[PDB]
Structure formats: C-alpha cells, structure tokens
Amino acid sequence: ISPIFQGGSYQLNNKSIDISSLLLDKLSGESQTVVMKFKADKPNSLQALFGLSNSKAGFKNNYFSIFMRDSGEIGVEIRDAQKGINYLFSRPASLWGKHKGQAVENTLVFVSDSKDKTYTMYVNGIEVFSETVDTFLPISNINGIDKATLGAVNREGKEHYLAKGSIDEISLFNKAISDQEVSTIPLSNPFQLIFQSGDSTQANYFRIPTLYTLSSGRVLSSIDARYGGTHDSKSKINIATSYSDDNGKTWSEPIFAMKFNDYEEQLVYWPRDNKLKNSQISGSASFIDSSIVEDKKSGKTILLADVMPAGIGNNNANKADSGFKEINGHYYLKLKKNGDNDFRYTVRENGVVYNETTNKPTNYTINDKYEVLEGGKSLTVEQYSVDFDSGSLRERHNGKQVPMNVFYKDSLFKVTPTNYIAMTTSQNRGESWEQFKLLPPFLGEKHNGTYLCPGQGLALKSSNRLIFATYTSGELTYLISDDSGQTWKKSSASIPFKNATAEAQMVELRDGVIRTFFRTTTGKIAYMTSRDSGETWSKVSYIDGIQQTSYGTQVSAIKYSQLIDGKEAVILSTPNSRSGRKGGQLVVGLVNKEDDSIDWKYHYGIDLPSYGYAYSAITELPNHHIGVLFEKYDSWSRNELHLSNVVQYIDLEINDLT
Numbered sequence: 275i276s277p278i279f280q281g282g283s284y285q286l287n288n289k290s291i292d293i294s295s296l297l298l299d300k301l302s303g304e305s306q307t308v309v310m311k312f313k314a315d316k317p318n319s320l321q322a323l324f325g326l327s328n329s330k331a332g333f334k335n336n337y338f339s340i341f342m343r344d345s346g347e348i349g350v351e352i353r354d355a356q357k358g359i360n361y362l363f364s365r366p367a368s369l370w371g372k373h374k375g376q377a378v379e380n381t382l383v384f385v386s387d388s389k390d391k392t393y394t395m396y397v398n399g400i401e402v403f404s405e406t407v408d409t410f411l412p413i414s415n416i417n418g419i420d421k422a423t424l425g426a427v428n429r430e431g432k433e434h435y436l437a438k439g440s441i442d443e444i445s446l447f448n449k450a451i452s453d454q455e456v457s458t459i460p461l462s463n464p465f466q467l468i469f470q471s472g473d474s475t476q477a478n479y480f481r482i483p484t485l486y487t488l489s490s491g492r493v494l495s496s497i498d499a500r501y502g503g504t505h506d507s508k509s510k511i512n513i514a515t516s517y518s519d520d521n522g523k524t525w526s527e528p529i530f531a532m533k534f535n536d537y538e539e540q541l542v543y544w545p546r547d548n549k550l551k552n553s554q555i556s557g558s559a560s561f562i563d564s565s566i567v568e569d570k571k572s573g574k575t576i577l578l579a580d581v582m583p584a585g586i587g588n589n590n591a592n593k594a595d596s597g598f599k600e601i602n603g604h605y606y607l608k609l610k611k612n613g614d615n616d617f618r619y620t621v622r623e624n625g626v627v628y629n630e631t632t633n634k635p636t637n638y639t640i641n642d643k644y645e646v647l648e649g650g651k652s653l654t655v656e657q658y659s660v661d662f663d664s665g666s667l668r669e670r671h672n673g674k675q676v677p678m679n680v681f682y683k684d685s686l687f688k689v690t691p692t693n694y695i696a697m698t699t700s701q702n703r704g705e706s707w708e709q710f711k712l713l714p715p716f717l718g719e720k721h722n723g724t725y726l727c728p729g730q731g732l733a734l735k736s737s738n739r740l741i742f743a744t745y746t747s748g749e750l751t752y753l754i755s756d757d758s759g760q761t762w763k764k765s766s767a768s769i770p771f772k773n774a775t776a777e778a779q780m781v782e783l784r785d786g787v788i789r790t791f792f793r794t795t796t797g798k799i800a801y802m803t804s805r806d807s808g809e810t811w812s813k814v815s816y817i818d819g820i821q822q823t824s825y826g827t828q829v830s831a832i833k834y835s836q837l838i839d840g841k842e843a844v845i846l847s848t849p850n851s852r853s854g855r856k857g858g859q860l861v862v863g864l865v866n867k868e869d870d871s872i873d874w875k876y877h878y879g880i881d882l883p884s885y886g887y888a889y890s891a892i893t894e895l896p897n898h899h900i901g902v903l904f905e906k907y908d909s910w911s912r913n914e915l916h917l918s919n920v921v922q923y924i925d926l927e928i929n930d931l932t
Contacts, residue, residue, distance in 0.1 A: 277309075277445035278302075284441040288318075290325075290426030290433050297422040297446065298326075304388035304412035305450040308340065309459060314369070314439030315377035315882070317344045321437035323382075324444070325427035328418035334429040335360070338413040340384060341435060342369060345856075346885045348397055350384065356417045359409065363393055365402040366914040367907035371882035373464035374930045378881075379442060381461050386413050387450035399461045400919040465922040468495050468516050468525045468903060475499040475514045475528050476539040480921045482728045483903040485891040486566040488575065493518045493893060494704045495903055496531060496564040496577060502555035502660065503544030503916040504909070507587035510537045510558040510660075513579045517704045522901045522925055531577050531698055531707040534559040536584060536682040538659040538672060544916040545662065551915050553667040555660055559584045559681040561696070567731030571738045572758040575700040577707065578742055580726050584683035586691045593722045596715035597690035599630070605714045607640075609680060609687040619687060621680075627687065638687065642709045645677040646687055652677055655684035692722045695744070697759060716751060716764040724751045725775075729830050729891060732780040732788065734807055741808050743790060745776040750792065752808050767802060767811035771795055775826065781833040781844050783870055789844070791817075793826035797852055803870065819874050820861060821852045825910065828889040834862075835894055838928065841865060844872060845931070847890040847902060851883070855908040858887025860900070860931055878931040880904070880924075886914065900926045 278300040284291050312323055320343050327337035335355045341364075342348050349364025370378035383396040391410040395403045421428040424444070425437040469480045477499035484496045494517045501510040513532040516525045537558040545551055564579040582591070598605040599620050609619035609627060619636070622628045625647075627638035639647045646653045654675040661668050680689050696710040716724065724744035731742040740755045752765040769776055771794055778792035788804040790811075798816040827849050834843040841864035851857040858880035863872035880887060880902070888909035893901050907920040 275447055275449050278448050279446045280444070282441070282443045284424050284444070286425035286437040286439045286441065288436045288438055290428070290436065291424040292421065293424060294420070294422045298419070300446070301414040301448065303448050304415060305448070306386045306413055307447040307449060307451045308382070308384045309443070309445045310340070310382045310441060311379050311443040311462070312382065312439055312441045313377040313379055314342065314437070315372045316438055317342060318436065318438055319344050320435055321425070321439070322427045322435035323425065323437055323439070323441065325421070325423040326413060326416065326419050327421045327423065327428050328416060329421045329428040329431055330418060331430050333418055336416050336418060337427050337429065338416060339427045339435065340382070344884045346371070348382070348395065348402060350393065350395065352393070352411050352413060354411060354416045357411065359411050361393075361407065361411065363395070363403050363405045365395070365917065367886045367917055367920055368397045368402045369885070370398065370464055371885055372879070373881065373924070374926070378464050379462040381459065383456050383459060385450050385456070388412055389450070396456055398463050465924050467919060468923050469497050469499070469514060469528055469921060471541065471918045473528055475512065475530070476541045477501050477512070478541045478543065478918055479504045479916065481905060481909065482563055482889055483891040483905065483921055484564055484566050484729050485893040485901055485903050486568065486730050487893045487895060488568050488703050489570070490703060491519070491896040492703050493522055493895060493901060494566060494575065495525070495891070496566055497921065498562055498564070499528070501537070501540060501542065503551070503553070505554050505915070507560045507562045507582040508558070508585050508590070509555045509560050509587070511560040511562050512539070513561045513564045513577070515577070515704050515707070521895045521897050521899065522923065529706070531564065532561045532579055532696065532710050534561070534679065534681060535676045536655065536657060536679065536684070538657055540659060542660065546916050550662070550666070553662070555667070555669060557585050557658060557669050557683045559679070563726045563728040565726050565729055565731050565742055567733050567740055567742065569738070569740055569758045570733060573701070574758060575703055576697060576731065576740065576759045577700070578695055578697045578713070578726055578731070580723070581681065581694040581696045581712070583681045583689050583691055586693070588693070590691070591722055592690060592692040594720050595690050595692050596719050596721055596723065597692050597694060598715050598719065600719050607712065608690055612686050617690065640680060643677065644680050646680060646685060653686060654678055655682055693725070694723045695726055699759065713753070713762060716753065717746065727778045728828060728889065729779045732782065734786070735782055736785045737807065739807055741780065741788075743778040743780060745774070745778060747773050750776055750778050750790065750802075754808055765808050765811070769800070769814055777828040779829060779831045781831050783833065783842070783844070783865060787870065789870070791829050791831045791846060793822070793828060795824060795826060797822055797824055799829055799846070799848065817874065820846070820848060820850050820859075822849065823852060823854060823910070827855050830890045830892045832892055832894055834928070836898060836928070838862060838932065839864060839875070842867070845892060845900065847892045847904070849887045850877070855888040855910050856886050857883040858890070858904065860892070860902070860926070862931055876932045878926070886920070895925070898928070900928070900931070902926065
C-alpha cells in the first residue's frame with residue numbers, strides 16, 4: 275500500500291516539530307506501520323523521535339512514542355491511563371551513530387498489528403523485538419490523542435524527551451506490513467552480517483568473532499554459534515566458520531568447524547526478563563573461544579577452541595585435573611563408566627578403552643569423533659531439546675538417537691568434567707573441517723587445560739613456526755608447533771596477575787620479534803615481547819592512552835603490511851572506556867626502529883563513545899583495506915544479554931583511520 279503520510283528532512287535541534295494537522299486525521303483502523311530513516315550522532319541521554327499524545331492537562335500518561343537512548347537502545351511506549359495500559363518494549367544496542375566520521379542513516383520499521391496483537395521493531399534490517407500482548411492497544415486509539423510530534427512527546431503542553439538528530443524520511447501506513455514487505459525496504463547500513471539468526475547454524479546468538487586472511491586471498495572467519503542465549507559455557511555452543519573470496523563483500527553460508535549433537539540445534543528467543551534471563555542450558559557439551567592460523571608449509575588451516583563436557587564451563591570445571599593420565603611420558607584421556615565412582619578407564623592407542631584397575635583392555639573403542647563403539651558397533655544416546663513452554667527452562671529427550679560421545683551427559687563412558695583444548699584442520703581453506711583432536715596437557719596431570727585466546731594464532735613469516743597463545747592462572751602459555759600442528763610444546767611467560775582473563779593476541783614486529791598485547795585487571799592493556807620466536811618472553815609493560823574497565827576486554831591486533839607516515843605500523847582494536855564495553859576504537863601505532871617502542875598515533879572511533887563495542891577481530895584484507903568483525907554491544911552488561919545480530923562486519927581504509 276501507499277503511505278497515508280510521508281515527510282522528510284526534519285532537523286531535530288532540541289525543539290519538537292508539530293505534524294498533527296498533516297497526520298492525525300489520516301490515521302485510521304487499528305494497525306499501523308511507521309518507517310523512519312533518521313540520524314543521531316549526538317543524541318541526548320533519552321530522546322523521543324516520534325510521538326502521538328494526548329497533550330491535555332491530566333492525561334500525561336496517554337501517549338505513544340518511539341524513543342532511543344544514548345546507549346544505542348531503541349524502544350516504544352504505548353500508554354493509556356483510562357485503559358490501564360502502560361506498555362514499554364525495547365532492546366539495547368540497536369543503533370548506529372557514526373561510520374567513517376559521518377552520521378549513519380538508520381532505517382527503523384515499527385509494525386503495530388491488531389490482528390495478531392503484536393508489536394514488532396526492526397532497525398537496519400534486523401528484528402530487535404517482537405512482542406505479543408493479551409490486550410492490544412492500537413497506537414492511535416489512545417484516549418484523547420491530539421498531537422503528532424517529531425523530536426519530543428507533548429505532555430500537558432510541554433516538550434518531554436527532547437531529541438537532537440534528524441529525520442530524513444518518515445512514512446506511516448494504515449496497515450501492519452508483513453515481514454516479507456519489510457525485507458524489501460531499502461537500507462543504508464554501514465555494516466554487513468557474516469553470521470546471523472536463521473542462517474545454517476540455527477543459533478539465534480553469536481559471540482567471539484575471529485578473522486584471518488589466507489594466502490589465496492580468501493578471508494576466513496570463525497565464531498561461537500551460541501544457542502542458549504549469549505551465555506558462556508555451560509551452554510550449547512558450536513564453532514562455525516564462513517569465508518569471503520571477494521575482500522569481504524560477500525560471505526559463504528556458515529558450516530561447523532566443531533559441533534556436538536547431544537542437544538538439538540535450536541533457534542530460541544531467550545528470555546530477557548530479570549526472572550528468567552539467567553536460564554542456562556545445563557546438560558549440553560559445548561565448544562567456546564576459537565582461534566585460527568594458516569600453515570605455509572602444509573597449506574592447512576588450523577582452528578583451535580576450548581571444549582567443555584556436558585554441563586561444564588569455566589565456573590565449575592575441575593581446576594585440579596587435566597583429564598589425562600600420564601603413563602611413561604605419554605598422556606591418555608581418562609574415562610568414567612556408568613556406575614563407577616572413580617575414573618577407572620583410559621583411552622589408549624587406536625582408541626582402545628582400557629581398564630586401569632585390572633590393566634585389561636575392554637571391548638570398547640573410541641572413534642575419531644570421540645564416539646563410543648562396542649565391538650565395532652556404534653552406541654547411541656537420545657538427544658535433548660530445550661523449551662520454555664512451561665514458563666521455565668526445560669531440557670528433555672526428543673526421541674532422536676545420535677552417536678554416543680564421551681563428552682555427553684548420557685554417555686556410557688564420560689570424560690573428566692574439566693576444560694580441554696581441541697584442534698581441527700581444513701585442507702580446503704574452510705570448505706570443510708576434519709574431526710577435532712584433543713591437545714595434550716601442557717602443565718601436568720593435575721592442572722586443568724589452559725584457556726585459548728580467541729582470535730588468530732601466529733604464523734611466523736620467516737619459518738614454519740606456529741603459535742597459539744593461551745592463558746591460565748599466573749601466566750600466558752604459548753603453544754608452539756614447528757611441524758604443521760602435529761606436535762606442540764609450551765612456552766610459559768609469567769604475568770603479575772592471579773586468575774586474570776589474560777586474552778592475548780600477537781603481532782610479528784620484525785623477523786623473530788613478537789609483541790603480544792593482552793587483557794589485564796588493571797584498566798590498561800599490557801604487552802610483552804619475544805626476540806627468539808616465542809622461546810623466551812620479556813617482563814610486562816602497559817599501554818598508556820587506552821582505557822579498559824577493571825575486568826577488561828579482549829583486544830585484537832595486526833601488523834599492517836604497508837608503511838604509515840614512513841613507519842612500520844601495528845593496529846589494535848579494543849573498546850576505549852573505563853566504564854563499560856563501549857567506545858570502540860582502532861588505534862594505529864608506529865614502531866620506533868631504535869627500540870621497538872610503539873607510538874600510538876591515531877585513534878579511529880568505530881562509532882559513538884557511548885555505543886557498545888566488545889570482543890573484536892581485525893584483518894588486513896588482500897586489497898589492503900581493514901576488515902573488522904566485532905560485538906556491537908556491551909557483552910559484560912547484565913542488561914544486554916541475549917541480543918541477536920549484534921556481531922557485525924565493517925570495511926575500513928587506512929585513510930579513514932588517520
């Protein structure tokens with residue numbers, strides 16, 4: 275249909291614009307759609323973009339409004355005091371502010387559907403909320419509405435929620451347009467999605483992005499596909515990957531690099547209310563935090579990630595047990611059988627399950643997918659699905675048999691409830707991935723696995739050496755391979771933090787010289803240096819000029835291939851804020867060849883200081899542009915859990931940053 279009202283280029287400069295005469299008598303029927311293209315690069319703390327209100331004395335709570343916050347949150351209020359209705363629907367982190375120094379044109383579509391009794395909000399082509407109510411309130415049915423307002427709500431004759439911004443285009447329709455019709459509305463997005471709700475992963479949530487440019491020019495990305503809301507393990511999470519062959523312009527449909535099937539892949543709208551938001555899938559195995567590297571010698575791509583057995587996460591993992599038994603300098607995975615109170619089994623050569631009490635081999639073997647075979651025959655377990663139909667989280671058997679895996683809750687043989695690191699490889703640059711293999715323990719029998727630093731591993735330019743940083747209590751533990759990832763050794767580097775989440779990323783400043791940048795608990799990003807390709811490490815220094823919170827955030831880093839201002843350059847990506855995970859920046863540092871010190875010379879604001887920015891991935895694209903895949907929300911805030919389509923990708927050029 276055609277709009278009943280259409281207007282444009284309204285400047286909102288802390289003074290509302292009255293459009294009552296143009297709009298109010300056009301509103302008819304109980305369903306409406308508002309389409310608005312707007313900019314707000316310097317918003318007030320809380321401002322209304324659009325309002326329909328009863329402006330009369332005594333009716334201050336009779337209004338509809340579309341509002342936004344300087345946090346990037348978008349929402350509506352639908353209120354009628356006579357009807358006893360006060361609806362407020364919103365979602366944090368729904369907006370863009372600025373991109374490449376220019377105000378972003380956000381495209382907002384709000385659908386008020388009387389038939390389905392549903393209110394649905396889209397911003398920039400992303401559905402941010404859809405709420406059904408028992409008692410529907412049509413937005414123009416509010417008792418005594420007499421004002422239509424841009425840039426404020428008129429309450430009792432005064433301007434409330436005054437806005438700063440502009441509305442370049444606004445249209446209203448006397449219909450609830452369909453999801454299909456919404457998808458046809460042209461967008462002006464500064465970003466694209468690689469992974470997204472409804473894609474092949476069927477996860478409604480994503481966290482922990484990575485990016486890595488392969489030698490063929492293919493750009494590869496990995497991610498946590500998170501099913502049970504955005505929660506860290508324990509949960510259900512798989513590792514997914516996608517690649518681009520055209521410098522990031524388009525991306526392949528995701529495939530899995532690492533997946534478990536003890537629970538169904540379900541796209542679930544996780545509750546965001548205070549009473550249920552901490553609901554957590556508690557019986558599923560999961561993977562979490564992935565990292566990628568390419569090996570020049572073999573041509574293989576190698577991906578590592580943490581692995582968690584059913585119901586296990588950082589919080590409850592046995593810190594005092596590697597999950598392996600040492601027997602003659604060799605490490606074997608320990609297993610517990612149904613009914614036993616200790617772990618009386620190990621997995622030996624060729625997957626043979628072996629009885630430790632009586633030194634007997636059994637009739638069980640573990641295959642290459644960590645699945646249990648009895649006499650060569652595949653054992654199975656029944657899969658679980660989750661639902662909130664009862665008003666709380668239920669996890670229950672769904673009738674489907676899947677291969678019995680030692681990481682599962684229902685398995686005959688179970689691994690130690692602690693965290694591990696696994697690796698997988700691809701021989702076709704991410705078109706398919708092999709079955710994963712567990713890495714051995716590096717810090718002894720009675721120490722849980724170290725935690726993988728998400729992002730990139732490091733392929734040294736002048737050798738075959740591959741390094742993946744990991745962290746644990748009191749140190750960074752670098753994992754080093756010189757044989758294409760077939761065998762690994764550790765190199766430990768003490769850090770002056772006990773129990774830090776010391777997520778670390780590396781750059782090779784020059785041949786054999788590695789600087790590692792890492793998250794701390796001090797509000798400053800730290801660094802250390804190796805001058806012997808990772809064999810030994812310097813003391814820890816701190817970067818001045820960037821602020822993080824007390825708890826810190828992952829930082830990503832690359833060595834740029836081109837000189838900047840005549841100097842070698844490193845680029846860091848991180849939030850810059852002492853308050854929360856917001857104020858994302860790319861910071862360009864120029865290397866001083868005298869001493870390898872770095873002058874952090876340029877700070878590029880990814881979006882507003884108040885808009886969300888958490889974990890991130892950066893890569894130099896083959897055309898020398900910079901690709902950034904990042905969590906565009908505060909992934910620490912307990913108010914911003916369970917948001918969809920906030921991991922987003924942008925393309926930048928060096929001239930944008932400087």
